[PDB]
Amino acid sequence: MLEPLRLSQLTVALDARLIGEDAVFSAVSTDSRAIGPGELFIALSGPRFDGHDYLAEVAAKGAVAALVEREVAAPLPQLLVRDTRAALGRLGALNRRKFTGPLAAMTGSSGKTTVKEMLASILRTQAGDAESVLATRGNLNNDLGVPLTLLQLAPQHRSAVIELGASRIGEIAYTVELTRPHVAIITNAFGGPEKIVEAKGEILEGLAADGTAVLNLDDKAFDTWKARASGRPLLTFSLDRPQADFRAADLQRDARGCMGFRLQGVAGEAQVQLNLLGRHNVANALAAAAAAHALGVPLDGIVAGLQALQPVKGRAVAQLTASGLRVIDDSYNANPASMLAAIDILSGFSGRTVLVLGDMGAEQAHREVGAYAAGKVSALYAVGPLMAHAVQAFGATGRHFADQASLIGALATEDPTTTILIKGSRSAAMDKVVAALC
């Protein structure tokens, strides 16, 4: 928060009644399992629990008051409102309006998180100060996550990078109104494909008349979004089109498989080597570049921020071993969805490819993973009792191993130009296989 807030001064803003003594809070929590002294507890009703049941617990941990939508017959002061979700929203908006620094917001696919992390890297590198830039923590990006994020804005922040997510029409329109960005980015596009396009376009309505929209010229929804931008300043990005404001030429993988390119367009020209796999991440880099340009960052800061960004440990971390093997460490976690994506990542390499799996934390889901890999990778090597079903479904170039030591022994024979991707749920400990090779 920009400053502490007093209960009696929020009755107008929140249309609330104060019950009990006045109090001053300096942060908020929506969870009695993570609250401490000085904090306002906000009681939310959910599908499993009701925050209103935990007033004794928050009071004993030092919460100064509770925001509630019914009066509990209570161990601390209550600020009573009609809707605690809506009141949280108002508190987010209220705190945002005390923040005077540059603020960008982004939505689209899961690419939005990557654009957030790219842009945050750019801003923090340019500033030489990571704590001076606020960015949405994880995916705290919905009708609750956005205002909780805006409530983190504090006197040390000089700029902010907010992610907005949606699973319905109206959600982004609500949160972007709280957020009021100077720059809004849509990476790409509920009730169907046109509903998705309408939802993502809501981010543009949160811009002022001179706010900048960052749009993908390659997206089928470009025309619709440009129309909805209604004349606001626009920066475009493309992998294909010479007229886009931000462009990439000479896309090339380095030895790890990480994408490099030549940035072109209105910020100038420069070579950029990312530490990330995938052609689509070049497009995310262009969107981050455009947003940073709009916020005043020079070419060399854009380049340095993009090259500084590292993948999260155990999440598609590509690297070369001493023996010239390409190893993609995806060993953090796994489920059916993420297995399928990993297979598709590995399928983009042209040499021998080897998918290396441990059990997902049933037997049909393992069959489905094995069968989906057939036709996309050269071999499937796996360990774990459930993964026998994957190997069997995959076919004759699959191998099942009775333990990690024999799996590692097989992999130690793989030759340069081969690419290996290692993945399992946290319980499989496939990070040990990565450690043995790297």
Domain of residue 178, CATH code: 3.40.1190.10
Judgement on whether residues 164 and 226 belong to the same structural domain of the protein: yes
Q: Please give the structure tokens belonging to residue 13.
A: 């803003």
Judgement on whether residues 205 and 56 belong to the same structural domain of the protein: no
Q: Please give the structure tokens belonging to residue 190.
A: 């509920």
Which residues on neighbouring strands pair with residue 5, listed in sequence order?
A: 25
Sheet holding 65-68, edge to edge: 17-19, 78-80, 65-68, 39-42, 27-29
CATH for 40: 3.40.1390.10
Q: Give the residue carrying structure tokens 């104060």.
A: 18
CA within 13 Å, CB half, 125: 20
Do 180 and 206 contact (CB within 8 A), yes or no? yes
> 3-state DSSP call for residue 115?
helix
Q: How many CB atoms lie within 10 A of CB 101?
A: 14
Q: Which amino acid is at 366?
A: H
Which residues on neighbouring strands pair with residue 290, listed in sequence order?
A: none
Technique behind the model: X-ray
Nearest residue to 387 (alpha-carbon basis) of 355, 411, 358: 358
> 3-state DSSP call for residue 198?
helix
The answer on whether 139 is annotated among ligand-binding residues is yes
Judgement on whether residues 92 and 214 belong to the same structural domain of the protein: yes
Rounded to whole angstroms, what are the CA distances from 105 to 2, 13, 64, 150? 19, 25, 32, 12
Judgement on whether residues 102 and 166 belong to the same structural domain of the protein: yes
CATH for 379: 3.90.190.20
Judgement on whether residues 297 and 319 belong to the same structural domain of the protein: no
End-to-end CA distance of the chain: 43
| Alpha helices, H only, 143-207 | 145-151, 171-179, 193-201
Q: How many angstroms separate the CA atoms of 180 and 330, rounded?
A: 36
Q: How many angstroms separate the CA atoms of 348 and 109, rounded?
A: 20
Q: How many angstroms separate the CA atoms of 78 and 70, rounded?
A: 9
Judgement on whether residues 167 and 288 belong to the same structural domain of the protein: yes
The answer on whether 257 is annotated among ligand-binding residues is no
The answer on whether 113 is annotated among ligand-binding residues is yes
> 3-state DSSP call for residue 283?
helix
Q: How many angstroms separate the CA atoms of 354 and 392, rounded?
A: 16
Do 380 and 405 contact (CB within 8 A), yes or no? no
Please state whether beta strands 326-330 and 317-320 pair in parallel, antiparallel, or not at all (unpaired).
Answer: antiparallel
Please state whether beta strands 246-253 and 259-265 pair in parallel, antiparallel, or not at all (unpaired).
Answer: antiparallel
The answer on whether 32 is annotated among ligand-binding residues is yes
Judgement on whether residues 77 and 92 belong to the same structural domain of the protein: no
Nearest residue to 162 (alpha-carbon basis) of 248, 81, 95, 104: 104
Q: How many angstroms separate the CA atoms of 219 and 60, rounded?
A: 53
Nearest residue to 181 (alpha-carbon basis) of 155, 145, 213, 227: 213
Angle, to 10 degrees, between the axis of helix 193-201 and the axis of helix 171-179?
10
Q: Give the residue carrying structure tokens 């059990």.
A: 359
Q: 68 in the Ramachandran plot: left (φ > 0), alpha (ψ -120 to 50) or beta?
A: beta
Q: Please give the structure tokens belonging to residue 44.
A: 């939310």
Q: How many CB atoms lie within 10 A of CB 340?
A: 14
The answer on whether 97 is annotated among ligand-binding residues is no
Last residue of a domain, one of 81, 112, 139: 81
Q: Please give the structure tokens belonging to residue 375.
A: 């036709």
Q: Count of domains in the chain? A: 3
The answer on whether 125 is annotated among ligand-binding residues is no
Q: Please give the structure tokens belonging to residue 15.
A: 């249309």
Angle, to 10 degrees, between the axis of helix 299-308 and the axis of helix 111-127?
120
| Alpha helices, H only, 230-362 | 280-294, 299-308, 336-347
Q: Which amino acid is at 214?
A: V
Q: Which residues of 416-426 are buried (b: 16+ CB within 10 A; e: fewer)?
A: eebbbbbbbbe
Judgement on whether residues 295 and 186 belong to the same structural domain of the protein: yes
Do 135 and 182 contact (CB within 8 A), yes or no? no
Last residue of a domain, one of 310, 334, 360: 310
Do 10 and 79 contact (CB within 8 A), yes or no? yes
Judgement on whether residues 282 and 395 belong to the same structural domain of the protein: no
Cβ neighbourhood burial of 172 (10 Å; 0-12, 13-18, 19+): buried
Judgement on whether residues 176 and 303 belong to the same structural domain of the protein: yes
Q: Please give the structure tokens belonging to residue 140.
A: 């705290």
Q: Which domain holds residue 426?
A: 311-438
The answer on whether 163 is annotated among ligand-binding residues is yes
Judgement on whether residues 432 and 385 belong to the same structural domain of the protein: yes
Judgement on whether residues 413 and 374 belong to the same structural domain of the protein: yes
Q: Residue 304 carries which DSSP code?
A: H
Q: How many angstroms separate the CA atoms of 130 and 322, rounded?
A: 33
* Phi–psi pair at 207, nearest 5 degrees: -80, 145
Last residue of a domain, one of 310, 340, 368: 310
The answer on whether 48 is annotated among ligand-binding residues is yes
Which residues on neighbouring strands pair with residue 104, listed in sequence order?
A: 161, 183
Q: How many CB atoms lie within 10 A of CB 118?
A: 28
The answer on whether 112 is annotated among ligand-binding residues is yes
Q: Please give the structure tokens belonging to residue 93.
A: 């908006």
- The structure was resolved to a resolution in Å of 1.9
